[PDB]
Structure formats: C-alpha cells, structure tokens
Design the sequence.
C-alpha cells in the first residue's frame, strides 16, 4: 500500500493507477528483498565458523539484515489487514519498533564505519554491549515513550501506521531522520578520506577511472547508511510523485542491495566461501 | 647433491672480452632463479647480475648495466655470463649462486662466505 | 585463567608491532632516540630490531609476517653500499610472507649526502649511469634556502627506491618514503601517520571501499 | 685461510666413508615386515569404533 | 698445491662414496612393495578445533600419555592443553614473544621453549607451590633456536641458527656436547627410539645423523635440493623421513645410507613444513604451505588422504605415541585434532 507511509508526513492524494502500480512494485521489491535477506542470513550463519567472519562487523550486519527482514515481512502482512481492529492496533506499533530497530542498526553501521575509518586506532575493541543496547534498546525506549503518551494514534488512519493528521508520525520521523543526517555527515567524511586516497593513486598512474571507485565506494554505503530515506521527507515538495517512487523502490530493494554488496561482491566473503569449498 | 661449478676467467687484457660458465647439477635448473655475485679483494660479496627462471626477467647492477650480459640454457642446465670491455674494477672472484626458494621472485645469496648454494667461483684479473 | 587471557588479548591488540630493518652505519637506532617501546597519541608502538642473528635472514624473517610495518632505514650518503640496500629492499618487498606488510622507508643522514654532493669528490653518475638522464620531479617540494643539487640527488634516490616498490603490486602493501636528518623529533609522528594510513587502507579493503 | 676447515671436512668425509652399507633389498624387507607386523596396532590405519575412540 | 690436492682428494672421496651407494642400490624399494595391496583413501574428521591462541603457532609436542599437549604462539604464550576435554591445563607467558620451538618432557614434569632470544627456557610444571615458573634459562647459542627435544629430565638436545646443535645438562646448565658440521641453519631434529642417535636437518639441503655420546657426525645424507624444514624417524628407528622447501619428501635409511622413496606430485609447488609418521609407519603425514596437510602411503609413495580446514600455512604436526590422533597447528592460531 504505497510503501511510503513510513516517511510520509504530509497527506497527499494520488491517482488510482499510480497507487496500484506503486503498490505492485513495492510488493515485488519486498518479496525479492525478503528472499535476499534470508540468503544473507543463512550465508552468515553457515560461515560463522570461519575466523574471517565475526569481526564485530558481520554481527552488526546480520542484526541489521534480520531487523529489515522482520520489518519487511510484517509490512507485507500489514498490507492485507483492515484498519480499526486490535490486531492492526498492536501490529502498527510492532512495525514502528521493528523499523526503529533497523534505523538504530543503520546508525550503528555509521558509527562503526566512522570509528574504523576516521578514528582508526581503537577500532579493534569491545563495544558489543553498547552496540546491542543502541540497536535494540533505544528503539524500545523511544517506542515506550511514544505509545504511553498517545496510544490511539497507532492504526487511526486507513493504514496500520502512525496517523498523519494527529502529527504523531514525527515520533518516528524525527529520530529516524536524525539517524540519516548523522549518517550523511559521516558519509561525506568517508569520501574526504577516500577520494584524497585516490589522489595518492592519481599521480602514479594518471588514470581518471580511479575517481570511479570514489563513486563506487559511495554506492555500497547507501544500503547500510540508509540515506535514500530522505526522499520520503521530500514528499512535501510539489514533485512528490517521483520522490515517492524513488523512495519506495530504493527502500524496497534495499535488501537486494545489501545482499549484492555484502554477500556476492564482497571479495572477503567470496574468499571465505571458497575456503570452505 | 647440489653442485655449482664455475669455469672460465683468469687474466684478461683491459677492455677485452671474457666468458664465464656455470654448470649446475643435483637440481632442476629451470625451476630456480640464478644469480652472479662478485667479491673484490678486501671487500664483501656484492650482487652483480641475476636472471629469472625462464630468462624473461634479467637485471644487472648499476656498475655493469648494459656492459655485461647473462643467459641461461635449461636444455643442458648451464649459465653463461659474457663480460665486455673489462675494467680494473672488475678484478674479483665470481660466484654462480642458485638461491634456494623455487617459484619465487626474491632470494638471498649475498651472505658473507656462509652459503651452501654457491659455487667456488673463478678469479678474474686484468693485466697492468 | 580466561580473564587473564582476555586482558592479554586486549593489551596485545592495543599495541602495534613494527620491525626495524637496516644495515650497519645507517643509523637505525638514532631514528627514534633489543626492543623499544613508545607511545604517540595514546597508542603504543613496539619496535623490534633483530641484530643478534647471523646474515642468514631467510628463515627467521618469517616471524615478522604479522607486524604492522617494516621500518626500513637506509643511508642515502654512501653511494657505494646503495646497491646492497636496494637489493635488500627488493628482497623484503617481493617476499612471499612479507607481501602484505607495508614498508616505511627512512632516508637517514640527508646532511652527509649534502656535504658529499657539494664536495664533488664522488659523483652519482659513476655508480648510477641513469642519474644524468634524470630530472627533478615537478611535485617535489624543496625547503627554503635549499640547493637544487641536493634535492635532485635525494629525489633521484627516492625515485630509484620507488621504482623497485612499484615494480611489484602496490595494492596489497605500499611504501612510504621519508627524509630524515641526523637527529629528528618528528620521526615518531611520521611513523604514527604512516601507521594510520596503513590501517585505514586495510579497513577500507575490508569494507571494499578501496 | 680455509685450509683447516677443508682438512676437517675431508677428515669427516673419510670417517663417514668407512662405514659399510647393507643391500637396499634387505632394508626394504625389514621395513615391509615392520609395517605388516604393526599394522593391526595402528588406530589411524585401521578404523576404530566410536565406543573405543576417546576423541569421537 | 696442498690445498688444490685437498679439494681433489675430497672430490675423489665423494665420487667413491657415490659409486658405493650406487653399487648398494641393487633394486628400488617402490617395486618391492608393489605386491602388497594399496592402503586406499584415508578419511579424517576434525574431532576438536582448539581455540585460544592469539597469534601464529609454530611448535607442538604430544605427551607420552597421548592426552596432554603443548603449543607455542607469537603472542608470547606457551599453552598446555587437555585434548580430551579441550581445557587449558596451563598457560605460561614468555619473556620473549619470538618463540619458534617447544618441547614436552617424557616424564611430563618439564617443558621447553626457545626462539629469537637465543635462549632455551625450561619451565617446571610440578612445582610444590602449584605455579609454573622459569626453572632454567640455558644460554650460549649464537643463533635462533629452531628445535629442542627432551632426552630425559636431566639432558636436552637443541638445534640453533648458528648451524650447531647442543646437548645441555639441566642440572649443570652448560653445553655437555656440541655438534658442528652443518653449513646452513639447522631447522629441526628428531630423537630416535633407542635414544642413542638423532638426526638433524639444516638449510644446506642435507641431513646429519649424530651419536649423543660420541658427539660426532656419524652419518650424512644429501638427497634434497633445498632448505630442510622437518625431519622424523620411522617407528622402527632404522629410517627417517625428511621434508624440504623443494615441495618433496624423501625417505632415508641409516643402513642403506641413501634415499629410499620420494613423495611429490606435479601440482605441489609448496615446500614442506612439518612431517610425522604413524604408529606403524605405514602413513606419512606432511604439512604444506598450501594450507592443507597430505597423508601419503609410505610404502607406495602415493597420496592417501588430504587434511583441509586451515586457512593459513600449517606450521606444526604431531602424532600421538599410541597413534590415536594427529594434531595440526597452523598460522591461523588454531589447532585441529584428526582421527
């Protein structure tokens, strides 16, 4: 059901054909992403024995993948529920919690990337407790703060989501956006320590194609950082139709992107798999 | 047993030509990189040339670059070093060294008189 | 017994191990001032200088395949032993067990090189015939009041080392050349920055960002 | 300079050359007999049931 | 003159020795063993995966009870394991983290170390206070210690990087005997079952059999063409297998005074690191630089099994005294038990 209710702050009316096409592409994207994340999870599980995996990075990646898988499965179930009844009433806040957990794990991805890239010393430390308390604890705390103040907001609208008219949807938008913006601030910094590195490789061979990886290193960072969610915030503008299309397609193929950029194109994972064969 | 016998050399007129041969036995000559190292009187061992397994990669020290040439024949397991335009600085003992590691690019064969994979060498001197 | 092992693992991962390699009269000991420890920006570097063994370096060097970096100190003033230093650097760079370890090159005693090249008794062209067909790199940054001849010679030596460094693959490991005087208090900072760069490159390789 | 080392090496070679050597066939037969006699006592050569196997 | 005659006479002695060895080679060992049936495929599973070491492990040595084990790692740790329960019996930090060898006493009361520190450290495990301390610090070697084996609780045989071996007395603390003659660095040694003789392999592509009491090089074998990395006697004590960097293994017999079999394959280009024999000597286990071990039939010179699971170079390999299982340690800081 339009898949963009997650980050839709302003209510908008769209044509029936546009709605059905966006709903269908969201359905197929979520169906592909669920299978991709299942494959990623089983690949992580079978390869957990190898010491190359489990460097405190793959644990966070698996947690984020599981959170996104649960959120997408719950949303797909939610797409066929009539609003008003108590199953949708509790399942709306369940989706809220399981999406805030995914955003918290995205923030953990960003913080770990910043620590392991910028503050290069001290990265090989023990931060499992803080990471697990941020990924799973902070979403629970903010959700508890949420439903206690306004429980009736969940499921009020036609969707099993926070009502737009009451304005409570900001309780999801305000923290999640804060996750993205910070993840943006780290991202540019990462670029500032990558393209310059390409500059070190620019005076030895004189190949402009090196700049290409500067874009490539950016691209692989979109799925874990989740920058594209800002497109939903852009629903306020007049050209909201194309922004909503891009938001829906990117955040529905996020699982496939994660599987492609962390299981297939990861040379470390390829070597680990080849060692076991 | 690994044997590296050096032949040729002796007293040569300055600016002349000379040929040094290295016969290798006890191992497959084609699977190892070969080196030529010279020791001057009152001086330590110094690497002067090297040739890879297939002969595609050949390198020389700065003092002999272009002046000397090196070649290998794996059919009869032999090494050749041809020296042209000899100079008084070339008066030294020459050793044909087969460094131990096969199918590798680097190897150590310049050790101070303690090396089991080096030949006895030949003396090359120039007339006054 | 497990808690003690956990603390041992933490302290082992906290410190970074470096291997000091340099022939005699190069001045390897003077670089920082048979193990030495120092701390920069609250991270500990432990440098190991093996000097109690024989000239057979083929076997025991395999013990240093997990060090953070190899601090290779070379004297750029003695135009004679230079070739032995180049051969040693090439052997270290092209090692099967040292192909993943970066090398930080320290051209020690730049001043002695300066007096030797202004003296005119010895010419680089006699030992390096390609020095005549060489020009100072454009990107080279000279000091204020610094002779073109000394910078030309030192950058020729640096480029001669860099040719060997770039002959093999540079993606797995890189070389960081530096100019060192007789005494310098910035050597620790340079080592810390080079280690920063090496570990960042390794992290990016793990992230597939490079 | 190395006369003493060469003399010691050649003396060691002379000492080594004095010992006699038996035929290869006899040594081969002895090794075969040992392998065939101790074959039944080798846990690696002959599979062992998990009940009698401490590791498995 | 005298010196040229010295090399000439040494060369003629070598030629005479070669001719005598060729004359003694009446038949090959491979054809004699053709009549017996092949051993067949050998299948081993990783019963235990020992974890806890931080850095790469070089040395291990099984106990006489076939249950206790010792391992040495570059983190500076010598760990004594209980293989049955995978429990750390002991974990001793070392003064020098550059350790390349370790030993376990036959009585089990002592262990040994040694590495780049040029010193062999002997630790006592049966202290009254129940705490492991440095029992003795044997020094006097001018090269790195590559191997050490306990003859008994009183004397120990070690090999150093100065191309020399030394038999030390623990009570005295000094070199009781010194064995010299190797040209290259001595990398490993093995003790014969009769305890009277021992072989040593060096970086001169040759092995030397020495008598403990005599203190002289009893015998010399020159069959390899590269650095020798490992050596081990046959269980009968009349033969030994040697592994070298030339990606080949060679079996020598003390009485035959020459080579018996060569174990190699075209696809193998990685040098040998560790070798060991089975209880009956039928199976020869060899570690390789290709991250996996190979089990060959010692009587047919054909590969009978492959042991895979290590993602780094295999450094140490050891078979129990009763042949129950074989432990392999690699540069991945893990030990694997196979049975």
Sequence:
């Amino acid at each position: 059901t339009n898949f963009a209710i997650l980050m839709q702050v302003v209510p908008l009316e769209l044509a029936r054909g546009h709605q059905v096409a966006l709903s269908s592409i969201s359905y197929v994207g979520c169906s592909l992403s669920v299978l991709c994340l299942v494959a990623t999870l089983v690949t992580f599980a079978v390869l957990s024995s190898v010491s190359t995996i489990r460097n405190q990075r793959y644990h966070i990646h698996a947690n984020l993948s599981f959170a996104v898988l649960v959120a997408q499965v719950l949303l797909l179930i939610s797409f066929r529920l009539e609003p008003g009844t108590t199953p949708c009433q509790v399942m709306a806040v369940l989706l809220h919690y399981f999406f805030l957990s995914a955003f918290a794990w995205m923030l953990v991805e960003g913080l770990h990337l910043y620590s392991m890239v910028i503050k290069v010393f001290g990265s090989e430390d023990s931060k499992h407790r803080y990471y697990y308390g941020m990924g799973w604890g902070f979403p629970l705390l903010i959700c508890i703060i949420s439903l206690s103040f306004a429980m009736d907001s969940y499921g009020t609208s036609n969707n099993c989501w926070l009502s737009l008219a009451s304005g409570a949807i900001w309780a999801f938008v305000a923290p999640a956006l804060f996750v993205i913006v910070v993840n943006i601030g780290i991202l540019i910094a990462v670029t500032r320590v990558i393209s310059q590195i390409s500059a070190d490789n620019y005076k030895i061979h004189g190949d402009p194609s090196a700049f290409k990886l500067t874009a490539k290193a950016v691209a692989v960072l979109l799925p874990i950082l989740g920058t594209s969610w800002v497109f939903g915030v852009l629903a306020v503008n007049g050209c909201a139709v194309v922004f909503q299309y891009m938001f829906a397609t990117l955040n529905s193929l996020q699982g496939l992107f994660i599987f492609l950029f962390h299981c297939l194109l990861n040379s470390e994972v390829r070597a680990a798999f080849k060692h076991k064969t | 047993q690994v044997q590296l016998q050096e032949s040729g050399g002796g007293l040569v007129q300055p600016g002349g030509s000379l040929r040094l041969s290295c016969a290798a036995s006890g191992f497959t000559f084609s699977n190892y990189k070969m080196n030529w190292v010279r020791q001057a009187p009152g001086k330590g061992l110094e690497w002067v040339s090297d040739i890879s397994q297939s002969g595609a990669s050949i390198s020389y020290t700065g003092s002999v670059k272009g002046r000397f040439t090196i070649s290998r024949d794996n059919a009869k397991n032999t090494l050749y070093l041809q020296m042209n335009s000899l100079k008084p600085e070339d008066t030294a003992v020459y050793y044909c060294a087969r460094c131990p590691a096969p199918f590798t690019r680097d190897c150590f064969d310049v050790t101070s008189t303690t090396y089991a994979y080096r030949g006895q060498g030949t003396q090359v001197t120039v007339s006054s | 017994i497990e808690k003690q092992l956990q603390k041992d693992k933490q302290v082992y991962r906290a410190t970074h191990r470096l291997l000091l390699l340099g022939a005699d009269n190069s001045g390897k000991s003077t670089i920082v001032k048979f193990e030495t420890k120092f701390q920069v920006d609250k991270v500990n570097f432990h440098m190991f200088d093996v000097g109690g063994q024989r000239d057979e370096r083929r076997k025991w060097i395999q013990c240093f395949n997990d060090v953070t970096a190899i601090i290779f100190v070379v004297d750029s003033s003695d135009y004679n032993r230079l070739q032995e230093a180049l051969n040693d650097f090439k052997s270290i760079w092209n090692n099967r067990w040292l192909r993943t370890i970066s090398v930080i090159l320290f051209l020690n005693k730049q001043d002695l090189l300066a007096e030797k090249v202004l003296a005119g008794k010895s010419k680089i062209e006699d030992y390096f015939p390609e020095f005549a067909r060489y020009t100072t790199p454009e990107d080279a940054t000279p000091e204020p009041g610094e002779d073109p001849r000394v910078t030309r010679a030192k950058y020729f030596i640096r480029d001669e080392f860099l040719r060997i460094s770039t002959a093999s693959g540079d993606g797995r490991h890189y070389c960081y050349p530096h100019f060192t005087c007789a005494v310098d208090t910035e050597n620790a900072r340079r080592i810390f920055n080079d280690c920063r760069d090496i570990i960042q490159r390794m992290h990016l390789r793990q992230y597939e960002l490079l | 300079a190395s006369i003493a080392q060469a003399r010691k090496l050649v003396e060691q070679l002379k000492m080594e050359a004095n010992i006699d050597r038996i035929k290869v066939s006899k040594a081969a037969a002895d090794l075969m007999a040992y392998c065939e006699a101790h074959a039944k006592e080798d846990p690696l050569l002959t599979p062992v049931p998990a009940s009698e196997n401490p590791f498995r | 003159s005298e010196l040229d005659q010295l090399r000439q006479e040494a060369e003629q002695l070598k030629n005479q020795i070669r001719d005598a060895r060729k004359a003694c080679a009446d038949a090959t060992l491979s054809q004699i063993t053709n009549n017996i049936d092949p051993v067949g495929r050998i299948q081993m599973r990783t019963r235990r995966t020992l974890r806890g070491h931080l850095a790469k492990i070089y040395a291990m040595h099984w106990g006489t009870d076939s249950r206790l084990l010792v391992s040495a790692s570059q983190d500076g740790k010598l760990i004594i394991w209980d293989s049955y329960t995978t429990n750390k019996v002991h974990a001793i930090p070392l003064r020098s983290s550059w350790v390349m060898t370790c030993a376990y006493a036959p009585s089990g009361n002592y262990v040994a170390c040694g590495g780049l520190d040029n010193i062999c450290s002997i630790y006592n495990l049966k202290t009254r206070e129940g705490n492991v301390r440095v029992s003795r610090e044997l020094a006097g070697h001018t090269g790195y210690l590559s191997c050490c084996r306990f003859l008994d609780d009183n004397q120990i045989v070690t090999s150093s990087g100065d191309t020399t071996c030394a038999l030390w007395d623990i009570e005295t603390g000094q070199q009781t005997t010194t064995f010299t003659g190797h040209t290259g660095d001595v990398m490993s040694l093995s003790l014969a079952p009769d305890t009277r003789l021992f072989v040593s392999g060096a970086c001169d592509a040759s092995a030397k059999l020495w008598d403990v009491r005599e203190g002289m090089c009893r015998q010399t074998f020159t069959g390899h063409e590269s650095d020798i990395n490992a050596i081990c006697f046959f269980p009968n004590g009349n033969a030994f297998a040697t592994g070298s960097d030339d990606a080949t293994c060679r079996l020598f017999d003390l009485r035959a005074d020459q080579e018996l079999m060569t174990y190699s394959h075209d696809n193998i280009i990685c040098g040998i690191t560790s070798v060991s024999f089975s209880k009956s000597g039928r199976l020869l286990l060899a570690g390789y630089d290709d991250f996996n071990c190979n089990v060959w039939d010692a009587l047919k010179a054909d590969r009978a099994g492959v042991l895979a699971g290590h993602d780094n170079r295999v450094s140490c390999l050891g078979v129990t005294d009763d042949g129950m299982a074989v432990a392999t340690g690699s540069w991945d800081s893990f030990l694997k038990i196979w049975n």
